[PDB]
Write an enzyme that holds these catalytic residues in place. Structure first.
Site, short mmCIF file in Angstrom:
data_model
loop_
_atom_site.label_atom_id
_atom_site.label_comp_id
_atom_site.label_asym_id
_atom_site.label_seq_id
_atom_site.Cartn_x
_atom_site.Cartn_y
_atom_site.Cartn_z
N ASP A 1 0.60 -0.87 27.71
CA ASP A 1 0.44 -2.29 27.51
C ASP A 1 -0.22 -2.93 28.73
N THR B 1 -0.24 -8.80 22.57
CA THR B 1 0.38 -7.53 22.38
C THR B 1 0.47 -7.14 20.88
N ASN C 1 1.54 -13.41 18.98
CA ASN C 1 2.88 -13.00 19.30
C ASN C 1 3.93 -13.98 18.75
N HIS D 1 -4.90 -4.33 25.64
CA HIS D 1 -5.62 -5.49 26.21
C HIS D 1 -5.51 -5.36 27.74
N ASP E 1 -14.15 -16.45 5.07
CA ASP E 1 -13.49 -15.11 4.91
C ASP E 1 -14.33 -14.00 5.52
N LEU F 1 -17.13 -13.07 4.57
CA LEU F 1 -17.90 -12.37 3.49
C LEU F 1 -18.85 -13.36 2.78
N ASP G 1 -20.66 -15.72 0.47
CA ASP G 1 -20.23 -16.62 -0.67
C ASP G 1 -21.09 -16.32 -1.92
C1 LIG Z 1 -11.39 -6.27 6.58
O1 LIG Z 1 -10.92 -5.18 5.78
C2 LIG Z 1 -10.07 -5.67 4.70
C3 LIG Z 1 -9.51 -4.44 3.91
O2 LIG Z 1 -10.58 -3.86 3.20
C4 LIG Z 1 -10.79 -6.70 3.82
O3 LIG Z 1 -9.68 -7.33 3.14
C5 LIG Z 1 -9.65 -7.15 1.73
O4 LIG Z 1 -10.57 -8.11 1.18
C6 LIG Z 1 -10.66 -8.15 -0.26
C7 LIG Z 1 -11.60 -9.32 -0.72
O5 LIG Z 1 -11.24 -10.57 -0.08
C8 LIG Z 1 -9.24 -8.35 -0.84
O6 LIG Z 1 -9.33 -8.14 -2.23
C9 LIG Z 1 -8.44 -9.07 -2.93
O7 LIG Z 1 -7.18 -8.44 -3.18
C10 LIG Z 1 -6.20 -9.15 -3.97
C11 LIG Z 1 -4.98 -8.23 -4.14
O8 LIG Z 1 -4.45 -8.10 -2.83
C12 LIG Z 1 -3.08 -7.63 -2.67
O9 LIG Z 1 -2.98 -6.21 -2.73
C13 LIG Z 1 -3.71 -5.52 -1.69
C14 LIG Z 1 -3.68 -3.99 -1.91
O10 LIG Z 1 -2.42 -3.44 -1.59
C15 LIG Z 1 -3.16 -5.93 -0.30
O11 LIG Z 1 -3.82 -5.27 0.77
C16 LIG Z 1 -3.24 -7.46 -0.12
O12 LIG Z 1 -2.71 -7.82 1.17
C17 LIG Z 1 -3.06 -9.17 1.58
O13 LIG Z 1 -2.12 -10.19 1.20
C18 LIG Z 1 -0.77 -10.06 1.63
C19 LIG Z 1 -0.02 -11.31 1.15
O14 LIG Z 1 -0.74 -12.49 1.49
C20 LIG Z 1 -0.72 -9.91 3.18
O15 LIG Z 1 0.54 -9.48 3.67
C21 LIG Z 1 -1.80 -8.97 3.74
O16 LIG Z 1 -1.88 -9.17 5.15
C22 LIG Z 1 -3.18 -9.25 3.11
O17 LIG Z 1 -3.58 -10.59 3.41
C23 LIG Z 1 -4.97 -10.77 3.81
O18 LIG Z 1 -5.84 -10.76 2.68
C24 LIG Z 1 -5.57 -11.81 1.72
C25 LIG Z 1 -6.44 -11.57 0.48
O19 LIG Z 1 -5.82 -10.57 -0.35
C26 LIG Z 1 -5.77 -13.19 2.37
O20 LIG Z 1 -5.49 -14.28 1.50
C27 LIG Z 1 -4.90 -13.27 3.61
O21 LIG Z 1 -5.26 -14.43 4.29
C28 LIG Z 1 -5.16 -12.11 4.56
O22 LIG Z 1 -6.49 -12.27 5.06
C29 LIG Z 1 -2.52 -8.14 -1.31
O23 LIG Z 1 -1.13 -7.88 -1.18
C30 LIG Z 1 -6.82 -9.68 -5.28
O24 LIG Z 1 -5.93 -10.59 -5.89
C31 LIG Z 1 -8.20 -10.36 -5.12
O25 LIG Z 1 -8.78 -10.54 -6.40
C32 LIG Z 1 -9.33 -11.86 -6.71
O26 LIG Z 1 -10.74 -11.95 -6.51
C33 LIG Z 1 -11.45 -11.04 -7.37
C34 LIG Z 1 -12.90 -10.78 -6.93
O27 LIG Z 1 -13.10 -9.38 -6.91
C35 LIG Z 1 -11.32 -11.47 -8.84
O28 LIG Z 1 -12.07 -10.66 -9.71
C36 LIG Z 1 -9.84 -11.36 -9.17
O29 LIG Z 1 -9.61 -11.73 -10.50
C37 LIG Z 1 -9.02 -12.22 -8.19
O30 LIG Z 1 -9.26 -13.59 -8.47
C38 LIG Z 1 -8.00 -14.18 -8.88
O31 LIG Z 1 -7.29 -14.68 -7.75
C39 LIG Z 1 -7.94 -15.77 -7.10
C40 LIG Z 1 -7.19 -16.13 -5.81
O32 LIG Z 1 -5.80 -16.24 -6.05
C41 LIG Z 1 -8.06 -16.94 -8.09
O33 LIG Z 1 -8.76 -18.02 -7.51
C42 LIG Z 1 -8.79 -16.52 -9.38
O34 LIG Z 1 -8.90 -17.63 -10.28
C43 LIG Z 1 -8.15 -15.25 -9.98
O35 LIG Z 1 -6.89 -15.52 -10.58
C44 LIG Z 1 -9.13 -9.52 -4.22
O36 LIG Z 1 -9.56 -8.33 -4.87
C45 LIG Z 1 -8.19 -7.40 -0.22
O37 LIG Z 1 -6.85 -7.74 -0.61
C46 LIG Z 1 -8.23 -7.53 1.31
N1 LIG Z 1 -7.21 -6.61 1.93
C47 LIG Z 1 -6.54 -6.88 3.06
C48 LIG Z 1 -5.56 -5.83 3.60
O38 LIG Z 1 -6.65 -7.93 3.72
C49 LIG Z 1 -11.50 -7.75 4.64
O39 LIG Z 1 -12.37 -8.49 3.74
C50 LIG Z 1 -12.34 -7.09 5.74
N2 LIG Z 1 -12.93 -8.18 6.53
C51 LIG Z 1 -14.29 -8.24 6.74
C52 LIG Z 1 -14.74 -9.46 7.55
O40 LIG Z 1 -15.13 -7.41 6.29
CA LIG Z 2 -17.16 -16.28 2.03
ZN LIG Z 3 1.71 -9.17 28.29
#
Ligand SMILES: *[C@@H]1O[C@H](CO)[C@@H](O[C@@H]2O[C@H](CO)[C@@H](O[C@@H]3O[C@H](CO[C@H]4O[C@H](CO)[C@@H](O)[C@H](O[C@H]5O[C@H](CO)[C@@H](O)[C@H](O)[C@@H]5O[C@H]5O[C@H](CO)[C@@H](O)[C@H](O)[C@@H]5O)[C@@H]4O)[C@@H](O)[C@H](O[C@H]4O[C@H](CO)[C@@H](O)[C@H](O)[C@@H]4O[C@H]4O[C@H](CO)[C@@H](O)[C@H](O)[C@@H]4O)[C@@H]3O)[C@H](O)[C@H]2NC(C)=O)[C@H](O)[C@H]1NC(C)=O
Ligand SMILES: [Ca+2]
Ligand SMILES: [Zn+2]
Ligand SMILES: CCn1ccc2c(OC(C)C)cc(C(=O)N3C[C@@H]4[C@H]5CN(C(=O)c6ccc7[nH]nnc7c6)C[C@H]5[C@@H]4C3)cc21
Ligand SMILES: [Cl-]
Ligand code: NA
Ligand code: NA
Ligand code: NA
Length: 806
Positions: free
Chosen positions: A121, A159, A180, A309, A687, A689, A691
């Protein structure tokens, strides 16, 4: 309730957690106040200390001892780590010459080389050189194995965000550990260093390495250690686990050291008190490697020595107080320190207004040591916005400073002389990476890289398929002797149209004008050739970018530039052009100042119109290929085509015109020509990504012309700058940016001055990787080079940081 009445007899540092109310004997049980009554007695033995001595050699086993020096200890797997040195005349690992490890040399029944992650750390990158005299074990790992001069952490440089990023390959906005300390408004719950809420699974997103391993049938040691278990006992526990039968033995292990962070906070990064913690960490590494050598595993295991870090000089007196800026300071909640996050103290307060808070905190004091941002305006390289645990108002704090709400928080919560958390490109925040073992290369230096890339490599080392993450898999292949990951480039989804001349001038009613009606088989054939692509090899040096989503677009060729023009967004997705070292800058001629020309290759229905810009009193326009860099007066007319126009606020045009008129030629002079690809970015939902068309929140008034949230440029030349950019035989060199497209220059406190005093400083803050632009545009660049794909992956993850030498 824990009925701590069970017993740890033969359970010491058991790998499977037993569920409440049954008492636990695992390496975390202390943290949950859940250990069985005899855990200290049986599991935390300390008698006779940690080292064999000559008089202990061949002793009769006494099971009370912390470790053993008896003849049986090797078969039992519990000798003191210096047993063979003291009792069998062996050398310490650190005293042996290094010898290349060309293949794993592992005992029978080992299915794969185990991986040991040794995390430190607060281990600042420059400690590897600055402390090398006092860290001989770490210096052997570094010089004999594979090392980077530093590794870049994620923001914030705290951390828990960085440890969980190492484990997952994800940005904190995606894994959910964004500080943190955090408040999640959906749970209505607070995560704090002290207390139980942090143990709730709901905070921890993604899939960390130990879960990825377990799901794919690879056994993991438990990564986490209760603070009070001494380091010597953590090392002996790992070495005991490595002695388990083949069917029970983990393949991946983690050690964590709270030093040098703990002392660095007290003493500063280079306080004279810091030598002893560095010596103690080095002694721990020596114990591990001697122990591995005793088990004949020192040329079998891959070891990663990695930090979370760095550490910067920060003292009480360098604190900014929000009470010096805000009249309303009691109506806000601040998460303070080396970053600030602000939200309303009460959601029932209808007077709370983020815009007024931002204004009150913008450029108010001459040498102000923080800068406020709405989170969507933070540099996109931080990837710190798309999580509801990230407050809308963020304060980026200058290195060496803290921010706090009121002075009473600082003296009534001095002590500390070090801290961390600042922007992850700051040199003091950089940390370490060394890899040593059969799967890493021998005596190899690799360029700096980001910690989000390591999860993929750890999966590679264990034969695991990584969960989806933000690393670019393949970009670290150059660290590895074997187990490289060889991906294929993504498939192009949309193929371009190549329109020729299809429309007459009078079909256009765009409200545009141009004094271009001033008038030859020699020259006319030549211009038709340019429109068909005859200079394209000069301006499109690495292939056209591939479009990885479904859309309709056209390739448009010109003498001086090539573009991919979107029929849906009414502007180029990308514009590519090469400027040689000898290129001359020219002006926009008087008669062309307000010139916009219809493009007879593209329908009026798929074009922008000038009348929209005239009507939109806040919005002007600029050009992607700059008219200043035309190759001839005749070619310059191409730069005023409507298909090269993009919407730009007047404030932003100050930035863009200085970049185009001054900086591009300066870079070509400095780098021996440059190739530039520029274009718009739309990220209204922040996000990171691209739009889709239905996510666009702002259009040029009255029209269907979407307004970009940012503008990018990717600037590529030959790494060997004795070769011009357009005639480069070897590796490339890149720098890029993603500039926010803002209607004011409030971010730049000196913006009343000439652009030579502020624009390049802005552009450095918004430096980017090509990969960041790929995510934001759905484009895939460098498709046609003569370089290996993995080498191009590394190029696309490069960030030009503009910091002096580490
Ligand atoms: C960095 O790498 C990561 C990993 O590859 C990239 O993140 C992925 O991005 C994808 C696109 O944004 C995203 O896909 C979505 O997944 C939804 C299902 O997700 C759940 O299950 C997965 C799989 O186990 C899980 O990993 C998710 O975990 C997230 O959420 C929980 C609870 O909040 C958190 O504990 C966890 O930390 C994580 O949160 C992060 O991501 C979420 C987004 O999921 C953010 O909101 C948080 O802020 C945080 O950043 C989940 O548990 C799925 O529902 C989505 O599908 C919608 O969109 C599609 C388009 O394909 C559409 O067809 C579907 O129908 C659906 O739309 C519907 O829902 C809309 C919103 O509610 C609604 O408006 C519509 O009308 C519809 O009803 C989508 O497929 C994927 O989950 C994340 N994964 C992770 C781990 O974050 C990231 O993009 C990369 N970054 C870069 C810059 O490249
Ligand atoms: Ca975007
Ligand atoms: Zn420290
Ligand atoms: C390779 C070891 N490794 C990989 C991930 C990982 C990990 O992930 C969890 C976040 C789930 C936790 C672990 C793991 O055992 N821990 C134990 C310690 C916890 C309490 N902390 C603090 O008191 C603390 C420390 C320094 C600070 N500086 N400024 N403020 C600070 C507050 C942070 C956490 C440290 C990491 C080790 C880990
Ligand atoms: Cl306990
Ligand atoms: Na005009
Ligand atoms: Na206008
Ligand atoms: Na300004």
């Amino acid at each position: 309730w824990t009925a701590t009445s069970g017993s740890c007899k033969g359970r010491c540092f058991e790998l499977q957690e037993v569920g409440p109310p049954d008492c636990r004997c695992d390496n975390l049980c202390k943290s949950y106040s859940s250990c069985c009554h005899d855990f200290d007695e049986l599991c935390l033995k300390t008698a006779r200390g940690w080292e064999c001595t000559k008089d202990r050699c061949g002793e009769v086993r006494n099971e009370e001892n912390a470790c053993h020096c008896s003849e049986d200890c090797l078969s039992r797997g519990d000798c003191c780590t210096n047993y063979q040195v003291v009792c069998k005349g062996e050398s310490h690992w650190v005293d042996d010459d290094c010898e290349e490890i060309k293949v794993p040399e592992c005992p029978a029944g080992f299915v794969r080389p185990p991986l040991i992650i040794f995390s430190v750390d607060g281990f600042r990158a420059s400690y590897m050189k600055k402390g090398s005299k006092v860290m001989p074990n770490i210096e052997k790992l570094r010089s004999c194995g594979t090392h980077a001069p530093y590794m870049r952490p994620v923001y914030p440089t705290k951390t828990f965000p960085n440890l969980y990023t190492l484990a997952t390959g994800l940005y904190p906005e995606s894994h959910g550990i964004v500080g943190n300390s955090m408040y999640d408004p959906v749970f209505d719950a607070s995560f704090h260093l002290r207390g139980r809420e942090k143990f709730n699974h709901r905070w921890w997103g993604g899939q960390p390495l130990w879960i990825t391993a377990t799901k794919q049938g690879v056994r993991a040691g438990t990564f986490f250690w209760s603070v009070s278990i001494p380091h010597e006992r953590r090392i002996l526990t790992i070495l005991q686990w490595l002695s388990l039968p083949d069917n029970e033995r983990p393949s991946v292990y983690a050690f964590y050291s709270e030093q040098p962070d703990f002392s660095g906070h007290k003493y500063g990064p280079f306080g004279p008190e810091m030598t002893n913690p560095l010596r103690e960490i080095d002694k721990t590494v020596g114990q591990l490697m001697d122990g591995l050598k005793q088990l004949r595993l020192h040329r079998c295991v891959n070891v990663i020595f990695v930090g979370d870090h760095g550490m910067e000089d920060v003292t009480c007196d360098r604190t900014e107080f929000l009470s010096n800026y805000l009249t309303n300071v009691d109506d806000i909640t601040l998460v303070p320190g080396t970053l600030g996050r602000i939200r309303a103290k009460s959601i029932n307060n209808s007077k709370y207004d983020p815009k007024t808070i931002i204004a009150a905190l913008t450029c108010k004091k001459p040498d102000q040591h923080f800068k406020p941002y709405m989170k969507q305006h933070l540099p996109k390289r931080l990837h710190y916005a798309n999580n509801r645990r990230i407050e809308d108002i963020h304060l980026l704090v200058d290195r060496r400073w803290h921010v706090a709400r009121k002075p009473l928080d600082v003296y009534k919560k001095c002590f500390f002389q070090g801290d961390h958390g600042f922007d992850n490109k700051v040199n003091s925040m950089q940390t370490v990476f060394v890899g040593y073992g059969p799967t890493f290369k021998y005596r190899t230096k690799v360029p700096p890289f980001e910690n989000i890339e390591l999860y993929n490599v750890m999966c590679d080392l264990l034969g695991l398929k990584p969960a989806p993450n933000n690393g670019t898999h393949g970009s670290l292949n150059h660290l590895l002797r074997t187990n490289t990951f060889r991906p294929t480039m993504p498939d192009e989804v949309s193929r371009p149209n190549y329109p020729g001349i299809m429309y007459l001038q009078s079909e256009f009613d765009l409200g545009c004008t141009c004094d271009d009606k001033v008038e030859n088989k020699l020259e006319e054939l030549n211009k038709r050739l340019h429109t068909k692509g005859s200079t394209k090899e000069r301006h499109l040096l690495y292939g056209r970018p591939a479009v990885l989503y479904r859309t309709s677009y056209d390739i448009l060729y010109h003498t001086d530039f090539e573009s991919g023009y979107s029929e849906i967004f009414l502007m180029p997705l990308w514009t590519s052009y090469t400027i040689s070292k000898q290129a001359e800058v020219s002006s926009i001629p008087e008669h062309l100042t307000n010139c916009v020309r219809p493009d007879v290759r593209v329908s009026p229905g798929f074009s922008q119109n000038c009348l929209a810009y005239k009507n939109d009193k806040q919005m002007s326009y600029g050009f992607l290929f700059p008219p200043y860099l035309s190759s001839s007066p005749e070619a310059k007319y191409d730069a005023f085509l409507v298909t090269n126009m993009v919407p730009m606020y007047p404030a932003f045009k100050r930035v863009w015109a200085y970049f185009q008129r001054v900086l591009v030629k300066k870079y070509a002079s400095e780098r021996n020509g440059v190739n530039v690809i520029s274009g718009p970015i739309f990220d209204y939902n922040y996000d990171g990504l691209r739009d889709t068309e239905d996510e666009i929140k702002q259009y040029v008034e009255g029209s269907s012309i979407p307004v970009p949230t940012h503008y990018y440029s990717i600037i590529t030349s030959c790494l060997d700058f004795t070769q011009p950019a357009d005639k480069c035989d070897g590796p490339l060199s890149v720098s890029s940016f993603i500039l926010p497209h803002r209607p004011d220059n409030d971010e730049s406190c000196n913006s009343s001055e000439d652009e030579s005093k502020w624009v390049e400083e802005l552009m450095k803050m918004h430096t980017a990787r090509v990969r960041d632009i790929e995510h934001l545009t759905g484009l895939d660049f460098y498709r046609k080079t003569s370089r290996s794909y993995s080498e191009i992956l590394t190029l696309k993850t490069y960030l030009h940081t503009y910091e002096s030498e580490i």
